[PDB]
From Swiss-Prot:
The chain holds residues 179 to 424 of 431 of the full protein. The active site is at H46 (charge relay system), D97 (charge relay system), S198 (charge relay system). The modification Phosphoserine is found at S145. The lineage of its organism: Eukaryota, Metazoa, Chordata, Craniata, Vertebrata. Disulfide bonds join C31-C47, C39-C110, C135-C204, C167-C183, C194-C222. Glycans are attached at Q144. Changing S145E: Abolishes phosphorylation, proadhesive function and ability to induce chemotactic response. This is Urokinase-type plasminogen activator chain B. Residues 1-246 form the Peptidase S1 domain.
Length: 246
């Protein structure tokens, strides 16, 4: 997250932190995700496509810091890793960039909701907030494009939804943005998602309900003028989500 504010997991208690264990034994951060039911975290396929073995992954819930434990956190193995079969990637765009992780603890339990661990509601089909609506994004991604390190502390910021018309202009992304994607950005381009925020939640208030409107997917650089963040449009994937979680 470029700009924004530090936060703790109580403010985004559906946020999932996904790590990978290497053959060398070291564990590194991969991507964010969101808890949508006790046994299911939703994320982005591009996060796992290179290393699609479920066994290598670890998922934390209720975690506010990257490399230290947070009181109350839960740790899970990945029982199922479900990538979207129509995934594809260009040199920038990721299409159908959506994945599901079924989580299971070493005792064989799913998540237990708490003050730091809660599910996020899915949107109604094809039901998105109007352009110009303010939504929240959350992650452990870079604070500056030129940073080597990720922040130790969780961050969040606010971005406004951009119309498909505006995002499809040639100076923005042209055809790279599709109707299965949403764009969002700051009017001054001063705050944004970045590398390491992929898979994390774009949350909007819809009806009167915090709702998972998007999943961080891609962008050309971060917080660059005329280059919004691009998000998988969750309201266009409900049958896929339901089919793979039921
Ligand atoms: N919102 C904006 N502007 N960007 C992003 O969200 C974003 N930006 C980048 Cl550079 C990124 N990378 C960079 C390497 C290629 C893809 C994987 C990780 N992932 C993102 N999700």
């Amino acid at each position: 997250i470029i700009g924004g504010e530090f936060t703790t997991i109580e403010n985004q208690p559906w946020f999932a932190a996904i790590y990978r264990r290497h053959r060398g034994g070291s564990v590194t951060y991969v991507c964010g995700g969101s808890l949508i039911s006790p046994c299911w975290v939703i994320s982005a396929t591009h996060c796992f496509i290179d290393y699609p073995k479920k066994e290598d992954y670890i998922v934390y819930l209720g975690r506010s810091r990257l490399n230290s434990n947070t009181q109350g956190e839960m740790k899970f193995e990945v029982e199922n890793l479900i990538l979207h079969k129509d995934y594809s990637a260009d040199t920038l765009a990721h299409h159908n960039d959506i994945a599901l992780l079924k989580i299971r603890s070493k005792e064989g339990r799913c998540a237990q909701p708490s003050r730091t661990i809660q599910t996020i509601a899915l949107p109604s089909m094809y039901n998105d907030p109007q352009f110009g609506t303010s939504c929240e994004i959350t992650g452990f991604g870079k604070e500056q494009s030129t940073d080597y390190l990720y922040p130790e502390q969780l961050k969040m910021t606010v971005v406004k939804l951009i119309s498909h018309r505006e995002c499809q202009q040639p100076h923005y992304y042209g055809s790279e943005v599709t109707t299965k994607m949403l764009c969002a950005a700051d009017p001054q381009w001063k705050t944004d998602s970045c590398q390491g925020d992929s898979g994390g939640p774009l949350v909007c208030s819809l009806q009167g309900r915090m709702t998972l409107t998007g999943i961080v997917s891609w962008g050309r650089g971060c917080a660059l003028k005329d280059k919004p963040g691009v998000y998988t449009r969750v309201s266009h994937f409900l049958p896929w989500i339901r089919s793979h979680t039921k």
